[PDB]
């Protein structure tokens, strides 16, 4: 029964080279994705470029963090199994919901529809159903219907009506 | 020494068997990871969805692009012990900083105020405390207290004043 | 000669020592990433922490899904062949393109040009150039240069017209 162990020794030696080849392939593949994703470099010297998912602990406690320095994004929302992209590089396009603001700069503003009612052209035009002023008004031209007056009415230029009664 | 080399044979063989078992289990687990999570190999550039960073040379030089054809995200600020999510996937959640704009289409616009003030409502309404105009006007109603008729005026409808100077 | 096969067993033993070294090293690394980034363990129901691209089966077929607990992204557009620092997400700023709107809140609004030709301020003023109103107007203090008065006008206050024609 000597014949057994040596055949075994072979059943071993023969399997080791092939396993070595497989593990070498795996190690090379890890060398690939490591420079891709898992650089396994523990430092803040290169901003941890690539990708990182640090479950970092402070004196506060465990706090999650995900670090990527490459934007290169093109997203789609999955809600209801939907397939709508949202970040074409032309500065977002889904819709603007309720937004708080303190600085805006826009030439064109539209009320809505084949025709907007109250609009704000870059030319400075404005259509409205009201103009309430609690202060100064400097008007230049005008085609006006009713001007109800009961307070100071002093004139420096010209006035020419059709009927003047009083 | 009698059995030492012989026993090493079976010890090896058994250790290889178990080592191969754990390797097969783990390798199947990896086979499961890139199958769904990102991809691997040298997959062509047709759809290549999943997590992947590639450093391709350009005219300027390297380009480490990071591709994500994927879905809803939510992120928080980890700043030195901060825990407040800000833009967590609710369709432009909180607010915009200094922003330039081009065009819009909106029913309702306000100011934003505690004991508060002016707004641009869907129905043209505006209480603008200083409505300076340097061009044409088409008014169909108005109540003017202190009239400063500066240049040549005219009336098509009628004027009727209790007072008169001239 | 024969001593090669006997030597073969102990050579295999040393080779297994080396392979066990490397393999348990790698497995320990992956186990470290498991709660960090690998997420080898299952999630169950809704609990989820970390990363993973799950292409779940649905009655309609494929449903890829991605989930991030918390992150902070950099700013490089697809912009192949160009470096584009866009969407830094600093100070909650992205830059907005053409878009609709439903609800707005902005005390400060500009004309979308080098100066603000028409401006909205927390003071509530408006230096426009045309404001036509088909409804109510309440202008307290104002001047009128080239105006035609197309409907009724009544004064209960003082009247100091420059001239009267009729």
UniProtKB/Swiss-Prot annotation, chains A, B, C:
It is found in: Virion; Host cytoplasm. Transmembrane segments: none annotated. Coiled coil: none annotated. Belongs to the Caudoviricetes tip attachment protein J family. Interacts with host LamB. Attaches the virion to the host receptor LamB, inducing viral DNA ejection. During tail assembly, initiates distal tail tip assembly by interacting with gpI, gpL and gpK. During virus entry to host cell, binds strongly to host LamB in an irreversible attachment. The binding induces structural changes in the tail leading to viral DNA injection through LamB trimeric pore. This is Tip attachment protein J. It comes from Escherichia phage lambda (Bacteriophage lambda). The chain holds residues 830 to 995 of 1132 of the full protein.
């Amino acid at each position: 029964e000597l014949l057994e162990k040596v055949e075994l020794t072979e059943d071993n030696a023969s399997r080791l080279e092939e396993f070595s080849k497989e593990w070498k392939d795996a190690s090379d593949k890890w060398n690939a994705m490591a420079a891709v994703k898992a650089e396994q470099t523990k430092d803040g010297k290169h901003y941890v470029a690539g990708i990182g998912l640090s479950m970092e602990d402070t004196e506060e406690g465990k706090l999650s963090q995900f670090l990527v320095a490459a934007n290169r994004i093109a997203a789609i929302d999955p809600a209801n199994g939907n397939e709508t992209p949202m970040f074409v590089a032309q500065g977002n396009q889904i819709f603007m919901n309720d937004v708080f603001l303190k600085r805006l700069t826009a030439p064109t503003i539209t009320s809505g529809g084949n025709p907007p009612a109250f609009s704000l052209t870059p030319d400075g035009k404005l259509t409205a159903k009201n103009a309430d002023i609690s202060g100064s008004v400097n008007a230049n031209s005008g085609t006006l219907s009713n001007v109800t007056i009961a307070e100071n009415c002093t004139i420096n230029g010209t006035l020419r009506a059709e009927k003047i009664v009083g």
